[PDB]
Structures are given as C-alpha cells and as structure tokens.
Structure 1
C-alpha cells in the first residue's frame, strides 16, 4: 500500500470497478475492500497474537522461580538467577513486538479511510439530478464525518475477535487442579459480568443518540445569540434570552444525568469483578488441602489475565467490528444510486432542435412539460419568459441533458456554457474564478471583464486580481457575485450559451449596459438563450417563447404572439413601462396576467427520599449477578460454606458502591453551574473586552468547553479514583516488604514526569493542526456541491479532483504527525517501565529471600503492575487537558431635545478614537438625520448612545446625563433598527414578545398597525408559527416591520433608522415611512441615510466626516456647505 490519496484511490477503484462491472446481481463493496485489507491486516494480527500470548506464559515462569526458594530439592541459585533474566526478557520482548504492530494497524485504518473518501467524492459528482433532491443534505455530511474519528481506531481491536478464544481456551486449559472445577466458578463469574456490561453499554448508546439531537438545537440558539449581542443589549431583552438557553440546557441535562449513572455503574462493576475473580480463585485452597504458595501465586496471576481478556479485550472488538460493518453497508447503499447520464457530443448540427419533447422530474409528477418544440439556427437569439414554476429553468436542464425526455428528442451542437440563477461562490482567487479552468489570455480577459463592467468593483479590491474571495462571500454583494458568474460563463468559449436570470438583481442602468455590451456585442453570432422578464428583449429576439402551467403558451415570432394570443400580449403591454419595474414586480405582473388567462415514577420519588431503598437496589443487583453465574455453573450438567463466604463478599461490595453515589450527583450539578455562569458573564459583559475573540473563540470555547466538561469530568474522575487507590496499596506493600524497592523507584517516577511535560507541550500544539487542516475539507466539499451544475457544464471535474486530493494530503500529513509523536512517546514510557521491572525483580532475587513467600509476593506484584500503569499514563494526559480547559473558562468569569455635549468614543481605551468632541442637538419630535461616507463610523454614534463604546462627554436623555442612568433605561429610550436585522428563531409570539407581556389581541393590533397582519396570517399557525434560519421566509422589509412593532410595543421615544434604503426597494420603503410617521407621531425620528433624496424629509442634519461634524438647520445650508465640502 501507498501513503497518498492518488495511489490509494487507484487500488480501491480497480477492485471496486472490477467487481461492480462483474454484475453478479449485487456486487459488494465489502469484497472489494477485503481484497485490499487482508494481506496487511493479517500480519499485524498475527504479530499481536504472538505478543499477547506472552502474558499467558509469564506466570508459569514465576511458579518455577518461587519453587526455587523452597526448602525442597536444592538452593539452585543459578537457576533462580537465570529464570529471573528470562522473565524480564519476556516483558521486553512483548513490548518490542506489540507496539509496532499496533502502530501498523492504525496506519491501515488511515489508508482505508482515505480511499473510501475519494471514492465517495467521485460518486457525488456523478449523481442523477432526480435523486439529488431526495437525499437529505445532512446525510452526506454525516456520511463522511460520522466515522471520521472512529473507523481508523477501530481496527486496533479487530483481530481480538479472533485472538480472544485462543487465549481463553489456553488459560482454561492451563488450569492446575482442573477437575475441581474452580474453572467454572471463575468463568461463570466473568461470563456473567461480560453480558451485564454488554447490556449496560447498549443503554449508553440509546442516551447518546437522543442527547445529540438536543445538543444541536442548543448550539443553534447559542450561535444566534452570540453573533447578535448588540441587539440583545439594545432591546434590553437580556434575561429572557438567558431563560431560552436554560430550557435547552435543562433538557440536555435530564438525559445526561441518566447517561452519567450508566457510566458510574460501568466503572464500579469493573472494580467489583476484579475482587471476585481473585476471591473465587482462592476458594479451592481454603476448601480442604490448604495453601500452597507455589500454586496460589501462580493462580492469581492467571486469574488476572483472564479477567482482562474476557471482559475488555473481547467485547471491545465485537462492538467495533459490528459497527464498522454497518458503516460500510451505508456507504455501499450510497454508491449504488442512479447516475448522471453523460451527454453524447456530435457534429450533427449547428443549431438546437427539440422534437415533441414531453418530460418530467419524477414519478407521481404532474409538472410534466408537454409538447416542447424548437428549431433554432446557429447564431439566433431565443428569449424565454413565463409563469414562475412553469419550467422557466427546467427547460435548460433538458437542454443540457440533466433531465431526460420521457418522449421525443433533443439535438444540440457542441459544448454549452451555463450561468445558473444562483451564483457559485468558488472560494479562491477572483481572477481565477473569472477564467476558471481555462488559459489566461489578456486579450479575451480584458475584453470580457471590461464588457461585463467588472473593473468598476474589482479594481477596488486590495490585491486586485489576486484578491481572494473567502467563505461567506465577504468581498462581493449578490449582484456582484452574479456579475462574476456572467463573466465566467462568457469567458468560456462555447457553441451555446445559457443565461439563467441574467438581470442579476442589478440596477436597471447597468442591466441595460450589460445586455447590449454582452448579449448583443460580446456574444455576437453565438447561439444564445436568455431567461427574461423584459418585453424589449422579446422584441429583439428571433424566437419568442412563453410558458405557463407546464405547457407552451406561445412559441414563434414576436408579431405572431401578438396575432395569436393578443389578449395575453395586450395585458402585458398595459404595463408598458417595464424597465421601471424590478424583476420582482415584473414577475408578479406576468404571474397574474398569465394565471388570469388560464386557458418507575412513584418509586423514583421514593428512591430519592429513602436512601435505604437505594441501598437495597444496589444489593439486589449484586445478588442477581451471582445467581446468574450459578446458572452458568450448571453448564456442568452435560458447599454451604462457600455459599456463606460469597454472600459476605457481596454485602461488603454493595456498601462500597453505595458510598460513592453523591459523586455523580455532584458532577452533574457542577457542570450545570459553570455553563450557566459563563452565559451570564458574557451577556452582562463590557463592550470592547469581547473584541479579544471577535466571536471566534467565543463560539468555539463556549461550545467545546461545555462539551468536554460533560463527557470527561464524570468519566476521568472515576478512573483516577480507582487508579489512585491501587497505586497507594502497591507502593505501601512493597515499601514495607523491602525498603530497597522504594529507594530504586524514586528516580523512576522522576523520569516519567519530565518526559511527560515535554511531550504534552508539543503534542498539545500539534493538536491545533487537526482543526486547521480539517475545516477546509468540508468547505471544499460544500463548494463543489453547490457548483455541481457548472462543474459538469465546463468539464472541470479533474480539476476539482486534484484540488480535493491536495486537501486530503494536507490533512493526513498533520494527522499522521500527531499520531507518530504519540506512539513514540508511549514506546519510551514502556521501556522505562520495563527497566525498573528488571531491577526490582533482581532486588528480590539477590537479597536473602529465606522466607520465600516474601519473594513471591514481590515478584507477582511487580509482574502484574503494568496494566494499571498504562491507564495511569493516559489518565494523566486527560487531566492536563481538562485543567487547561478550566482555565480557558475561568478567564471569562474569575430629554426630548436630545443633548449631546463634547461626546468622544473608541473601540478600546488604547486603539483609535472613532468619534471625538462632537456636540449635537435634536429638537423634540424633529425629524433629523445623518449624512456621511460608508465606513465613517455612522454606527458608532448609535452605539455611543446605546453605551456600547469606550466614551467621554455628556449626553442628556430623559432629562438626565447617561452618567447617572444605568444601561437598561438609558438604552430603553432608544428603538433602533440596524441595517443588519436580528431575527430570533422560534415562535412569532416570542420573537415579537420574548417576555410574554403583550396579549394576542394587542399583538394583532400592532401587526395591523405596522402592515404585518397579512404576513402573519399567511404563515400557518399565525402567532404559533415558527420562524427559522434567521427569517429565511421573510422579506427584509418585514424584518424591519417586526422591529418596528417591537419599538412601538416597547414605547420607545427615540427611533433610529440605519439606512433602511440600503436594502429595501422604494416600493416598500415609502410604505414603512408612512407607517412609522403615523406610529411615531409623538416621537423623534433619527435617520441615517446614504442619499440626499432620502435625507431630504428631515429638518435638521448631522454631516459627519473625519471624527468631526457640521450641524445644519436646513437642507439648503447643508447643500451649500456639502457642495463646498463634497469630498
């Protein structure tokens, strides 16, 4: 196997394609995979087997070593000496064999994961357009992310399904004094514990899945709040929002608490089993014959080995192996989906023809396009219009071959260049998007970008052609994104060009220029099809097509339309001034014209009350498990004293469990408190201070830190308690038996501490790389999915495959480095442990072990100490991560006439002053407003009033200085509607009234007053309707009206309007102006405008530049000074 994506893919593709091609009904992915996997997997598997079997040998060697100190036979010093050497070598050898093999298995898991991802990516790009709208988008994201961190670890235990029975059979077969079947008492106990644990684990999974759903809901509300803190504070909404967080948190905790107990008992059960395998193991020796130390010591070491292979190594592989298989099956189901059918290019024609085409998207469809017919000559212009939904763009999908006809033929000449309704961001270099996938030629490039009028905006970009367009499209406005899409479609040389919604939400001035610049001249003599709403284009076009309800309304010459459907034509022409209508209005006009011319609980409470019931229930489980083991003992089918002693052990263990329950209760309580305090602290936080993270670390730390406290503190703490108790005992005993061991062990612990510290520093830094390399794999994926229509149209598939592989190689390189440093670290740790072991074995061998039982116990304690020690190393690592998280969390928590005198503001106490020494007056009830350049800090005046800035000077509102008024009422006076309107997700009643203070009747009254009554009636449920995704179903004008309704219900006196005109079309902007003037007849309205035409309705003006301002009492004085100062 290879170490890179390209090679890994070739091999997987060859086997997959060969089997898939060999069409034996249902070819399987699993077979393609075993043919890759098996020849490496099996080798690491056998090496691990050989490594593990060492544990089944070591106790035998000790029994003989112990015997050498017996008074029996002879004091063969030389044998004790050499056997001791052999024992320490067994430790060294398995260390040297096992770790490399584990590493190799992880290497394999990684290689397979990469091969699987590349296969899936290739498949998504070839999917049929029909199934494309049935496959939930969340499923493809989870298809790749769900096993991202599981698949590659899982192979580590896979060969244990195979090893486990070999070691169980051996250890069983090695039992000394086998017929007195202590073997069954032993196994019956362990077997029962294993099934108990399996069941418990299943319950754990049930809780994880349900909790995950609730987590996503909490996270969504959380980020919604974080990115809009200014509106929450401005609204003085505050604690209502805090309560929304609380209800989501409470829901998660109820589920978490139950999950926590599952984890608690799992761990205490583990402890319990330790005690009993040892206890039961000595029942033979108490029962008749008595004790033989030679055999007792040997017996216990073997018992320990069975416990671990039986209860942990085996079931871990079973669960892992099973889940891995299910994941593969899901991948296969995805791969076996209908394909995009390739278009056959030919030299049949020069034009475009459609022969009686009838077609539809899916079964059960009524949207069947009927009897579609075309004959377009080379170089002709086709203009198409019609009702929304009557195959306005679905026609294009037939043209490009995305949708097959059910009947009829489609003929085309050559290659097609397509520009979709919705622009594809293509994150990356802007020049490259314009000329993407093709050679750069300044002749053509300049001609296209100039003709498309891109220079007007692109030359303002900081790196010009090399300005990179990042995620979110932070560089371009929607009309600009559209403009680039056109330039891209045009730059590509094609025989046929398809323009989807080319008007681009652009200003009519540029719309005209682009049509003539591009449609007429740049595209001259090309075969063109335009989607359009403008009658002028139809007049110009050689062929006119109008669609309605799945069929042709009209197809032919412009004058033929008028002669054959004159009523349709006359109704449209009544709106003669179509250039004055925005696309939205043009669409409404045709839609109407065209449709008009149709042609447990009782006891749970008692369990909480009576702790004696809890004790009994704990004891009941213990009793039950021992009785079940008895059922397994009866396997022999094909004493009172023992009964008494085991009964005693059960009672003692039950009390031990009972004592620790308050810890679970305490743990849930603590994480709840921390989450709640952090939220409170962020809401009632100073402004500017949060700008240290700028919402990045705020969201990431808030989300991640809570998650780790909940999953790890309740887990790692119990392991630490058990490990701590074990080491205390181990050291105490050897220190007493032989003080030289202590002398020897002190430097050993010192060695481990130093290496650990160095390691963690570096590995913690490397961990950052996984996130850095991981994020872009998904950004790449999403971008490719949205761009699918053009990736196929322009033949760019291999370009993107190349990019995808480079991203994978980056990720794997960092992932791999992280893995490698960890493995090296663990190897070093184990070797240090191996060395002190040898030294200890010899301290005991060398000294006067004339009372041999003391020799025996030192040797077995040392031999079996390594299991606990490996856990201890890992637990210390987790602890350091937890403490670092705790610190990160802790860092956050441990006047009608408005009179402004000498006001000054900054974004920090250092930084820069965004405003200095401004004085300004607003007469009560006066309409006033602001003028200034974009980015002149317009919003910093509003924020200065809302007290969101580091500030100086005297502002008198509601008769008093801000200096004597707390933020809530100072801000309460101000009803502000920002350009970026905040929409709270949820029920409209709460969105409008998060406090529940207004009645439904009152809410409706205001909805009527502000013009939103029809809007709320339209949404099903009305007040109960749930609004989602930032108001993805609302006009931004509606969002502004919702804000208005809030301002009037809130009884604000100062109304602040942040350029409504920035986004709202005048057809509605005037409606809101009328509406608010009536609503605010007794209030003072302050407007911040971008144009003189809007500011014009104000009586007093504030003109701001360079952190200074000029106050005018008349628009004329403003204009006289503005002309002099128009700079």
Structure 2
C-alpha cells in the first residue's frame, strides 16, 4: 500500500490538485487495479478522530449539567470551519463586482465617444485578474470543507460503534436494525457533501445587501419593490421547506420496518423458498411501498416548486424592479442590461443558496440531536469481581424481562432460587421447556438485572449459547477469537470436540471462508465449533448452555466423556442437559419447572426421594417517461418558435417615445443580450410541464424496485449463497433511497439546463449565425474533458460504493451475536476490526472526492482561459466605430456560463445513475426454472447432489423407494448430509438423478407446482416481524377457529395466553421474545396447517425436554394418520415408530426394514443408548 502523496506534496500541488493526475493516467487507458488506490492520509485514521471526539465528548459530559454533543463538535472543528468560511466569503463576493466591470466593458462597444474608450484596457485587466483570483480562491475552500465533513462523519460513526457495544440488554429488543442502518445510510453521503452549503446561511444576507446597494445606485427607488417581492419569495420558500420536513418524519418511521422485513427475509431465504412463500411476502413489501410512495410523491411535488423559483422568478423580479423608474423617466438599455446582470446573481444568492443552506442546517442539527439522543441510553454496568474464593454463590434471586414489571414490583420467570458451587465441581441445571434455563444463565451473566437477590463468582467467564453464532472468517480465527494462538492448546481442543474428521472433509484442511453466520456449514459442525470456542478460552467459570442438542448419540457420549469430564476436569462448568446419563455423572442437580426451583440436591438424594445502455434501459422501462419527454420537447419547440417570432418582429422595428430609449448603435447588439439574460424564464418549466415528469420518475423507481426484488427472491440458491448480507442491505437501503429522493430532482435540473442552453444557442444562431462558430471551439472543448474524466470516476464509484458493504456486514453480526461478544469481553478486537473497514471505505471515498474537485478546477480553468482570451481579443480589436466581433464573442461566452453549470449537473447525474446501473445488475440474475399426490409412493434413482457447480461429492449414487403411508426414519452421524438430502429433495440446490412420484417425474411437472406437494419444518426456524396470525399463515386462508383448534393440538395455549395480544401481539427481532422450544412448536404448527401428503421433518425435536417431546409423537399419530413422513431425527427414542431406517454413511444411503439388524451391524453405536431407551429397543 503506497502512501498518499498528499503528505509529500508542494503547495502548488495542493492548490492545483496536480497530484491526482497519476490515478486518471492509470485509469483512462486500462481498468483500475486494486493497488493504485493510495493509503489514507495519516490524519483521518479512525483511531485519531475517534479518540479526539470521544475525549472532548466525555469531558463535556462531565462538565455541563445538560450535556450537548454539538458543543463538543464545535469545540473540535469550529476554527478550521471559519478559516474556510472567510475564504468562501471572499470567493463569493468576487461574483458581486464582476458584473460591474462587465457592464462597462459591454458599454465600450458603442461608437459614440465615452470616457470608457480609454479605461477599457484597465477594466479588461482587472476582470482577468478577478476571474483568476476567483478560480484560485473558491474551489480549495470547497475541498477543505468536504474534508472537514468527512472527518466529522468518520468520528461520529466510530463513536456510534463504540456505544453500540456497551448498550444494556433490556434496550436491544426495543431497537432493531432499522434505526441504525437508516441512521448511517442517510448520513453517509448527504452529511459529507452538505458541508459546502453550511456557510451560505450567512453569506446570502451580506451578498444581497451588497447587491441591493449597487443596484440602488443604478435604480434609485424601485430596487426596494424588487426586494419586497424577493422577501415574499423567500418566505414562501421557507414555508415550502417547513412543509417538506413534515413529509419526511412520517416516512422515516416506516423505512426501518421495510428494512427489517427485507433483512429477515433475505438472511434465511432457505425456509422462505422451501415453504413456497413468494406472493404473500411481495404483497406485504409492496403494501409498505405504497405508503412510502405516497409520502415521497408529496415531498417531491413540494421540492419541485422550490427548485423552479430560480428558473421562473427571473422575468418577474426584473419586471417589477424596472417598470416604475422606466415609466417615470425612461431607460437607456445599459441600465436594463446591467440590472439583468446583477439580478442573475441576486436570484442565485437568495433563491437556491439561502433556502438550501437553512435546509442543510435543519437536517444536520436533526441528525446530530438524534445521535445525541441515541448516546443517552441505559448502559450495562459490570461488577465482575476478580477477587473471589473460587466459589460461585447465587441467593434468593428473581427476574423480570420487561422493565414495567421491574418497576411496579404476570409471574416472574424465576423466583427464590439459590445454589453454591465449589471449584472443580459441576452443576447440571435441567428444566422442562419454558422453565428458564437460558434465563438463569443470563442472570448469572448479569446481562439480566436481578430484581432482588445476590450474585457472586469470579470475573473470568466463558459462554456457549443455545443458538450458535459464527463471525465471518476462518475456522482457526473463529475458534481462537482474538487470542495469541498456540499449537498444543488448539490441538487439544480439536482432539476433544473430535472435529478432526469433519475438518478433514473440507477441501482446505483447517481454515476456510465462512459467510455471515456461516450457512456454508451444517448444524452439528456449527454447534461443535461454538463448543470448541467455549473450551479454548481460559477462565475460572464456564457456562455451557445446552450445546448437546444438534448431535447424534455416539458423538454425544464421546464428546461428553473426553472434553467435559476429561480435558477440563478442574474448572467450574455449568451444564444444561436433558439426558439422565448427564445427571448420573452430574455432581449436583437443580431441576427447574415453570420458573420454580422444583428440586435441588444430589442424585443419590434423587434416588432416595422417588454505460449508455442504462441511459436507455432506465427511460424505456416505462412508457410514461417517453411520452412526457416527447411532449415536453414539442412544447419547447413551440416556445422557441415564439421567441423566434418575437425577435424577428423587434429586429425589423422602424425605430417622445421614452418607454424604451433605444438607439441604432446600441439596439442591434443589446436586444439580443437582454433576451439571452432572460432566457431561463421563457424556457423554464411550469406546473403543467414539470409535475408529470417527477410523477413518472417516481413511478419508474417503484417499478424498478419491484422488479429487482422479484428477481432476487426467485434466484437459484447456488448464486445466492455467494453474496453476503451487506450486499443486500446496502442495495435495498441506499440504492433505492437514491432512486427515490435525489435522482427525480437532479435529472430534472440537468434536463432544464440542457434545454435552456440548447434553446438559447439555437435562437441566437438563427438570428446571428457566426456566434455558433464562436461557441463550438468551447463545447467540443468541454466534452473532450468530460469523456476523459468519466473513465476514472465511472470505474471508481463502484470500487468505492461496494466498499460500503464491509461496514454494514460487520455491524449486523456484532449486533446479532452481541451476547457472546460481550461475554468473553472482546470489545477492543471488534473495535479495531470495524475501524479497519471504515479506513477502507475512506481510502476509496476520499480519493473519489479529491478527483471530482480536481475536475471542477480543470473545467472552470478551461472556461477562465477561454474567457480571458475572448475579452483580450475583443476589447483590443475594438475600432474607432461599431466594434462588432467583440459582441459576437461576449454573447457566446455569456451563454458559456450556464452551459458550464449544465456540464457540472451532468457529471452529478452520471455519478448518481451509477445506482440504476447496479440495480440492473441484480435484475439480470438467472432463473432456476384430479389430485396429483395420490398416495405418495416415491422412487429415487441415481440421485446425487452438488452445492457448488462441479463441487465436491456431497452425495453419490443414491436410490430407494417408499411405499405410500409408511414413515421412514432417516439418520446418520453429523456432517453426513441428512439436511443435504432433505434439501435436495426440493431441488433447491442443483441436482442430478430421477424421481418418480405416483406416475410423474421432475420433468413432467413445473417447479412451483412440484414444490406444492411437500411440507417442511426446517432445521433453521424462521419468524419475521408481525402478528401471530400473520406469522402462522400469511396467505390468510383459514379462520381463527382453525388456528385456535390447531393451537391446542400443538400445545401453544400457555404461550399465546400469557402474551398480551392473543394472535395480534407484534413480534420483533425475529421472535427474540419467544424461547427456542416454543419456536419449534410454532413451526411444527405452521406445518400442520399446510396439510401435505408427503412431508419432510428435519429434526422436529432439537432441544426439547423428555416431557414436551411426547406432544411430537402425539401429533405423529392422530394428526398425520396416513401421510408419508421423511423424519430425520437424532435422538434414538424417536426411531421406535418408523418402519424403515435410512442410515447415511460414506455419502451413500443404506436402508433396513428393522432396528435390530441395524444396531448389530454397527456395534459401536450400541453402547451409546441410555439404559432407559436400551430396554425399550431390546425387550
């Protein structure tokens, strides 16, 4: 990584941006490769800014009574803000006095002998130097302002992340991903680019005053009437501005809901596609989009009228400012022209520079105060005592989940529990489902505040949750988890959890690539990775929270009698089990039941007791756009014809008449100038030509989003597995926020500027031909630069924009699995691992900005050089009478200013349309594309499954047959592909082989009609945000009587009744309110509703107790009376019912008709069954 030459650069390079040149030199010819990007300047490393801002912030917190963040931000950046403000003030004043020189230079052309014929050269010199000072003084201030904005935003983001770790657990459920992702996404670009207009809040007044003086020297007593009209205009403008903000704070409440639905949708699309939930999800998403569109539509209309104020107030202001004086005394055309040339600047400085400045100030303060509110949130205070007697004590505790019951003190989820544990002794807390075992572990963690009672243990702790969590990276890094690696300890850990065979099964031996959460791995490997992590880290206390669920039985006995009982035989271990073998081995027992310590003691006591293609694809996608554009062009043609006839009539005029004092020496070259000064009004857009354009643009954005989603969802899984979660969150947030908010106005402004320039040039060329030849050497000079620039930026924006994802995809995981992350106490590690991604995105965005500002330098210097040459050639070549050529040049380069503005707008439009390019990238994704299920008799021949195209053999040469209504139980040691075969039944992943189902095959039936025959309860439960009734059946086919009768079969009464909204309670954060077993029962009910003839059960009993499990087998007898069942269990007890057994081994299936021959065939499997079940199998 080469160090940025910004640190090593001369002052001329910094004031001219000559050091950016190597990037464009490398980029214009060949595509950018990923070493050319410079390392960030040492100033804007996240650490320095974060430390500076946090020190100022916490000192300000300590000092003041009501701390405010904005005071610390001021104390940090105000000086380098004002040092730039003075330069911007000078560089905008230098636009007030330019028309002063310009008017007299224009006055010289007139043959009658004015004194100006001597001062013409001095005026030209002053004008030349004035332009060069403007160029050297304006842009560097803009770049520095953008740089300060960037630094501020970086420090704020790092502070946000530093807060989102110490955030108290009781608040997490309230705040979902939507708030945070919106608060970063909306800020990212707007708050950075918006610190160039922060000054124009106090620049606009002064400038206006300075203008209202000079115009007053021209116009004695009508400039005040013009100013009154302008003040009315500014009040109307601020009124529209206030109206618009009320139409955003009602959208920002639902953007988060749509974002969270989309994230939950795409993270586990596995179950979504398995269930054939395609249309209901689209209906819900578009239902949200409808309201969001109404709000965006109204906001867009309001924003449109705001924009037109410049373009359609120009004639009105001048008319009402020069009617009275002309009426009373008359006007020489010099007065009218200089009034126009001042009125342009006045219009600009009090129509699009004041209101946008106050807008950006309102919005920046709103975001800052929202962040300040965020930082005022309850902090989880830790009392982990390093001093202890190596003895863990817990006494008389009770806990409350929601804070209201906490303060008001519904039963608590615990009460009056107590235990005491030595060092070297193990507890085994076992509870029937819903008792609160995980809640007890959380209370031991202190993450739940005990409403009353006493806790004490060592400060050295480790954790292994019920639900696994896998941060993206290598298995080696994921297991070590930010510790100095060791050969011997790591090898011992891998020897205990017996990961050796599975780790040898992968292509890369030890370290592979795991995505967010790691769908790439199975369930057993994931749980055992988590357990290995909990074993590796060294501490005085261990909280293993039921890691023995997602495994077979032989692996269970091996791991439990080599790792828990043998490897770590001296260090305290809390164990959550549901097998009598553990309790027999257990040293003390605490059996919970419904939040009550139902039994405590010892097992002996227990026995005793009992790119231009996108430019077209965007437009042609909807016909309304083409119609609007065509009709607008026709209207413009009519308008330019009207202007043509007006100038034709006034050209052939045959001239007491003091209405307009006009003379032949002045007329022929002042009428054209004065018309071109008012071109932007006669060619403006009214409320009859503009509104359809904005409406159609918003409609097109909606259609684009809908198509993008419908193409993402039905995409094949092999493609989907490659892309991350950030690569969808980033898109669905930013690349639709842009297509809804910024584009439908920026493209409109571009259309307007292009249209105005074209019309003015056309009409003036028609009346004066040579001006065309006078302009062309500049326009062809313009595009030549633009086409050279775009190649750099056209390739760089992507290289930066995708760089956003390493932020979001790192924020989600840390937030998703915050609990273990804070459990081990590894905050600094993730702090640095986030700062790295932030510095990456900076190394992209900063250099992109430093290239755009350079192109502004170059474009305005092209204009200035042309302008200096024009003024020199023209004034010098003025003759004793009727100087002609100078008029021809100066009119052209009066047009050139607006044309340059149009070029800048065009660059901005392209930089935004990158977003539409990226969305069309997603839309081009491949497509996986009497009662039929009579008996369900199934036949599979020569099946094999592949995850990646041509990948390794996960299965090979499978074939079997299932008679109708004969449940076959499938089993096999973990990591052998049981879920693989279940998934490959649905041909989700790419397949090979042929299946006959009661006289039909795969080919003879369509895909969607094929998946209708099955019903699935996947290994990964799936609960989005919504109500119970909507969650259980989004299609809404069945009455609440149906739901209520099923909800007693599945034994869900005691879960619905305790919750306030029976079938109408809202669910948040993926059902985090519910437990695990309740989620399992919920999904099983969701499969009972969809009565399918052939059904696949993928581990219906994951962590359930021996008691509640009865319901499972219960709903297997009366409920599924005859339906064919593909049941994939691990607990051997659930295999007593099935008639055939399919054992999966060595990537092949072997079927047997019984159990005895199976078990004698594998001797090592025999000694693993518990005696209570071994007697059941062998009578």
Do the structures match in fold with TM over 0.5?
A: yes
Matched, 1:39 2:82: no
Aligned partner of 2:90 among 34, 43, 50: 50
SS at match of 2:290: helix
Aligned partner of 1:4 among 32, 45, 52: 45
| Unpaired stretches in structure 1, ≥5 consecutive residues | 554-566, 579-588, 590-640, 643-648
Matched, 1:755 2:785: yes
Write the mapping of 1:319-358 to structure 2, written as runs, cut at 5 A.
Answer: 319-329=359-369, 331-332=371-372
Distance 1:17 1:1004, change over 3 A: closer
Q: Distance in 1 between matches of 2:558 and 2:1002?
A: 53
SS at match of 1:1081: coil
SS at match of 1:2: helix
**1:51: how far off?**
1.0
Q: Distance in 2 between matches of 1:520 and 1:672?
A: 60
On the 8 A contact 1:293/1:853 being kept in 2, the answer is no
Aligned partner of 1:819 among 846, 849, 858: 849
Match of 1:68 in 2: 108
On the 8 A contact 1:353/1:373 being kept in 2, the answer is no
SS at match of 2:351: helix
Q: Distance in 1 between matches of 2:414 and 2:1052?
A: 37
Deviates more, 1:257-266 or 1:30-39: 30-39
Matched, 1:828 2:858: yes
Match of 1:262 in 2: 302
Aligned partner of 1:838 among 868, 878, 901: 868
Aligned partner of 1:859 among 890, 909, 929: 890
On the 8 A contact 2:308/2:685 being kept in 1, the answer is no
SS at match of 2:328: coil
Q: Distance in 2 between matches of 1:29 and 1:172?
A: 39
**1:61: how far off?**
0.5
Match of 1:878 in 2: 909
Write the mapping of 1:1022-1037 to structure 2, written as runs, cut at 5 A.
Answer: 1022-1026=1062-1066, 1030=1070, 1032=1072
SS at match of 2:215: coil
Matched, 1:504 2:551: no
SS at match of 1:1055: strand
Match of 1:662 in 2: 692
Matched, 1:727 2:757: yes
SS at match of 2:203: helix
Match of 1:715 in 2: 745
Aligned partner of 2:127 among 81, 87, 102: 87
Q: Distance in 2 between matches of 1:368 and 1:993?
A: 29
Deviation per CA, 1:129-161, whole angstroms, max 9, x where unpaired? 888888888666666666343433333222223
Q: Distance in 2 between matches of 1:318 and 1:51?
A: 20
**1:727: how far off?**
0.4
Write the mapping of 1:146-545 to structure 2, written as runs, cut at 5 A.
Answer: 147-177=187-217, 180-222=220-262, 238-284=278-324, 286-329=326-369, 331-332=371-372, 364=407, 366=409, 381=425, 392-393=440-441, 396=444, 416-419=460-463, 425=470, 428-432=473-477, 435=480, 438-447=483-492, 450=495, 466-467=511-512, 470-474=515-519, 497-501=540-544, 503-505=546-548, 528=572, 530=574
SS at match of 2:855: helix
Distance 1:840 1:284, change over 3 A: farther
On the 8 A contact 1:211/1:252 being kept in 2, the answer is yes
Q: Distance in 2 between matches of 1:891 and 1:474?
A: 24
Q: Root-mean-square deviation (CA), in Å? A: 5.7
Q: Distance in 1 between matches of 2:463 and 2:258?
A: 38
Match of 2:38 in 1: none
SS at match of 1:56: coil
Deviates more, 1:789-798 or 1:1014-1023: 789-798
On the 8 A contact 1:277/1:304 being kept in 2, the answer is no
**1:197: how far off?**
1.7
Distance 1:260 1:984, change over 3 A: same
On the 8 A contact 1:351/1:375 being kept in 2, the answer is no
Match of 1:110 in 2: 150
On the 8 A contact 1:902/1:916 being kept in 2, the answer is no
Deviates more, 1:177-186 or 1:120-129: 120-129
Distance 1:577 1:148, change over 3 A: farther
Deviates more, 1:721-730 or 1:532-541: 532-541
Q: TM-score scaled to structure 1, two decimals? A: 0.75
Write the mapping of 1:774-793 to structure 2, written as runs, cut at 5 A.
Answer: 774-778=804-808, 780=810
Deviation per CA, 1:517-566, whole angstroms, max 9, x where unpaired? 6777766777x475778999999999999999999x9xxxxxxxxxxxxx
Deviation per CA, 1:167-205, whole angstroms, max 9, x where unpaired? 121111112446732222221222222221222122222
Q: TM-score scaled to structure 2, two decimals? A: 0.72
Distance 1:757 1:1064, change over 3 A: farther
Distance 1:745 1:945, change over 3 A: same
On the 8 A contact 1:352/1:374 being kept in 2, the answer is no
Higher RCO structure, 1 or 2 (CA under 8 Å, sep 6+): 2
Distance 1:877 1:939, change over 3 A: same
Distance 1:803 1:524, change over 3 A: same
**1:302: how far off?**
0.7
Q: Distance in 1 between matches of 2:946 and 2:590?
A: 57
**1:434: how far off?**
5.2
Deviates more, 1:195-204 or 1:1094-1103: 1094-1103
**1:287: how far off?**
1.5
On the 8 A contact 1:987/1:1024 being kept in 2, the answer is yes
On the 8 A contact 2:463/2:824 being kept in 1, the answer is no
Q: Distance in 2 between matches of 1:479 and 1:419?
A: 18
Match of 1:599 in 2: none
Distance 1:90 1:662, change over 3 A: same
SS at match of 1:211: coil
Deviation per CA, 1:577-606, whole angstroms, max 9, x where unpaired? 99xxxxxxxxxx9xxxxxxxxxxxxxxxxx
Distance 1:492 1:1109, change over 3 A: closer
On the 8 A contact 2:591/2:600 being kept in 1, the answer is no
Deviates more, 1:750-759 or 1:845-854: 845-854
**1:103: how far off?**
0.4
On the 8 A contact 2:109/2:878 being kept in 1, the answer is no
Distance 1:78 1:1064, change over 3 A: farther
SS at match of 2:249: helix
**1:371: how far off?**
12
On the 8 A contact 1:28/1:332 being kept in 2, the answer is yes
On the 8 A contact 1:678/1:893 being kept in 2, the answer is no
On the 8 A contact 1:384/1:544 being kept in 2, the answer is yes
SS at match of 1:207: coil
Deviation per CA, 1:849-901, whole angstroms, max 9, x where unpaired? 85579966963663474255324422354245366357446646995374658
Write the mapping of 1:1078-1089 to structure 2, written as runs, cut at 5 A.
Answer: 1078-1087=1118-1127
